[PDB]
């Protein structure tokens, strides 16, 4: 033993869907009401995870990026990633797919540790079932969590479910 395991955590989905909100909440305990798009930031924080001591390392991707190689880099090293989309908003609930899609071309596998994650669920304005978001995740054979960065609902949930599965995925 030499220290701690470290598992690498990518958050990646459409532009304002809450991808900082929910680490800053993770991190912090603090809710972001401002709108600041990122480029690209990185986190680290120590948790208990079914009685084992880890360190997360969690990268906040941008939502609105065309095609970059440095991209891909980055994304090369994440061992699983969290998908996110907002609740009122369909079109980023579309843009999964190619979430998905980037993710199995850039590590080169059908079978990477995933969660979706379906934020907002705070507000009224709901467009996307909790069916049809357990309908997707069951045909990609993933975790489906339902999260609000203000209230923080299901926030630690799923960063130790992606733990979870990376953990499954490794044994
Ligand atoms: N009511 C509510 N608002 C939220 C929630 N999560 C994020 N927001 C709001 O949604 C806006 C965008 O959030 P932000 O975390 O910056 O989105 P992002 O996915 O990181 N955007 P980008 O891809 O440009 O970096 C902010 O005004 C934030 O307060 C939530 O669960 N509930
Ligand atoms: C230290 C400077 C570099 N950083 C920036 C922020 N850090 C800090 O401690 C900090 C404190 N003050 C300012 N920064 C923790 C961060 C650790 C980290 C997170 C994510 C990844 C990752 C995940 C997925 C794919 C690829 C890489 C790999 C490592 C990190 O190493
Ligand atoms: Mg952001």
Do not use: W
């Not at 990122?38 to 986190?43: A, R, V």
């Not at 990026?65 to 061992?79: H, I, V």
């Not at 009122?88 to 071309?105: A, L, P, V």
């Not at 995740?137 to 992606?162: C, H, M, N, W």
């Amino acid at each position: 033993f030499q220290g701690m395991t470290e598992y690498k955590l990518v958050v990646v989905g459409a532009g304002g869907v809450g991808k900082s909100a929910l680490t800053i909440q993770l991190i912090q305990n603090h809710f972001v009401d401002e709108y600041d798009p990122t480029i690209e930031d990185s986190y680290r924080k120590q948790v208990v995870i079914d009685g084992e001591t880890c360190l997360l390392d969690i990268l906040d991707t941008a939502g609105h990026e065309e095609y970059s190689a440095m991209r891909d880099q980055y994304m090369r090293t994440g061992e699983g990633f969290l998908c996110v989309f907002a609740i009122n908003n369909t079109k980023s609930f579309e843009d999964i797919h190619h979430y998905r899609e980037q993710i199995k071309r850039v590590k080169d596998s059908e079978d990477v540790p995933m969660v979706l994650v379906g934020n907002k669920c705070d507000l009224p304005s709901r467009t996307v079932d909790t069916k049809q978001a357990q309908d997707l995740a069951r045909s990609y054979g993933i975790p489906f969590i339902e999260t609000s960065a203000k209230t923080r609902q299901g926030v630690d949930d799923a960063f130790y479910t992606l733990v979870r599965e990376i953990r499954k995925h490794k044994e």
